[model samples]
Target: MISLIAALAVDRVIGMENAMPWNLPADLAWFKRNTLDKPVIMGRHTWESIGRPLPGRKNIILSSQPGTDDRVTWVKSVDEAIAACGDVPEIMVIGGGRVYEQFLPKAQKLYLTHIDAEVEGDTHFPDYEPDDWESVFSEFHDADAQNSHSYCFEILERR
Candidate 1:
């Protein structure tokens, strides 16, 4: 059992302000189907955007102070989330920006979506040296006129 991060990007950008504006329903479905029943780690801002506890998944919100969500196991640090996950299938680290930076060093695997286009964003992906990570899997999907986006789903293994 290990911790895993599953994320989707559009135009290589994670979000506009504090949240995602794209309606890529397939990506949302992918997240639910993959991360369900796992202990999930996320930043306070991500939790705020979510608005409520995601049913079936054990929510572990990483924050210095408690919010209104009693269902979430409020953790004061990243180490606490790792402890909460214990020995499980995988601990899902969902994110905004800062949270990803905290876990990237310890992360064993990364499920990433690389968007074909580039866009302006306040939050961006962390910089990585190629020698540190290996891209193990990738699948490119073209954006149709209806969808208006193209992205590649990639899996990276830490070196």
Candidate 2:
């Protein structure tokens, strides 16, 4: 099984110039809470964007080569990255666009943060049928002094 985890603007924009267009530490906290201790497979850009291995989770990064370091296990292919996840029941695809596309058909769950406002963007979440998914959980969060956008966290399970 696989899960795609991402935060997107109202228009489903996930990135602008390879970085998130909005600042929402509230969602960042929510990300960490849900992802910790789970195995995550991500594209190279997502790994580079994060700038380091996420603490408390296994980081399996897709790259041009296969290798290992204390911080990451770098693999060359999508299947290779999935292999690095080892015996997990569900793998989380924390993305920077391409990886989501690669795994969309295989993903059974989506953990999406829907920001309240739309912003100019270049990268977007992959297309999927709304009728194919069922929302199992959702909660709205209001913007505060630290976070600029009001958002809702929704978890959708594939039908």
Candidate 3:
């Protein structure tokens, strides 16, 4: 099944200046631990932000333009991403705003790290009816010495 994973703010803002706004070491480790070794789909902007394919995972990036690349698989559409997911046991829809909006409906589950703060940004998560999803699990990651931010990891299932 397709799983989408993202970290966002109260207003659903995921990025600012093409990078994550804050550093949450615990959440970063959590992401790397879970998504490593899986086939991951993201948008060109997301890849541009990171600038290199993460180790051990098959990096599949979405773009309107396409070509073959060693570290990244360039797909033109969301259907192509789904097809790639079929070849792998699990696929991760890693994001930028457009990419997430494209795949969110088709996702069976979402691993969202919702920060306990608001952020100013030009992009935001797409709005969906609340009834469309149900929270299966949630845990708060309170502020600490390293990270002066509060966050929650919320796992939601499509309803």
Candidate 4:
């Protein structure tokens, strides 16, 4: 199964200048908790944005260019990356806008943190049909000393 995961602002913005616009430790923890050992596929730019391979997971980068490293497996396409997962029960598509858009159609699940505030950003999540999905879980968290914005974690399954 393939899952797409992100933290989105009310305006659908996902990033600003290649980094997340909001600070929500709880949401970050939630992401780490769920994706710990799974294979994570991301675009070249997304990998650059993250700065390093995510530890404890197979880091697969989708790029047409050729390169290899001890930390990541680089492939040319989504199918190649997915194949590289190689029998992993589930693979996660962590994003940078374009990568999310490319895999959205094939994703069976979406793990999103819906932030309540809007912020300026250059990258936005692609639009999707609500009719095609069903929310299976939701948990709201109010803004606190550590987190600057209120948000809700939601898991949606393709219907």
- lDDT value, candidate 1, whole model: 0.75
Model 1: how far residue 143 lies from native, Å: 1.4
Sliding window of 10 residues with minimal summed lDDT for model 1: 2-11
The CA lDDT at 95 in model 4 is: 93
Pairs that clash in candidate 1: none
Q: Candidate 2 lDDT, tens digit per residue, 1-159?
A: 889999989778898876897889888998998888899988888887888889899998887865546578888988888888988877889997888998998899999999987789888999879999999999998989998888999999999
lDDT against the true structure, per candidate, is 0.75, 0.88, 0.83, 0.90
Write down the RMSD of candidate 3 (Cα, Å).
Answer: 1.5
Point to the candidate with the largest lDDT: 4
* lDDT at position 115, candidate 2: 95
Candidate 1 lDDT by residue in tens digits, 4-87: 554445434677777775665556766787688988888998888888899998898888876566778888888887887777
In the range 1-159, model 4's lDDT, one tens digit per residue, is 999999899778999988887778898899998899999998888898889889999999988888656569989988888899999788999997999999999999999999987789999998989999999999998899999888999999999
Lowest summed lDDT across 10 adjacent residues in model 3 is found at: 66-75
TM-score of 3: 0.93
lDDT of 3 at 40: 88
Can you tell me which runs of candidate 3 are displaced by over 4 Å? none
Clashing residue pairs in candidate 4 are none
lDDT of 4 at 73: 92
lDDT of 4 at 44: 85
Deviation from native of the Cα of residue 85 in model 1, angstroms: 1.9
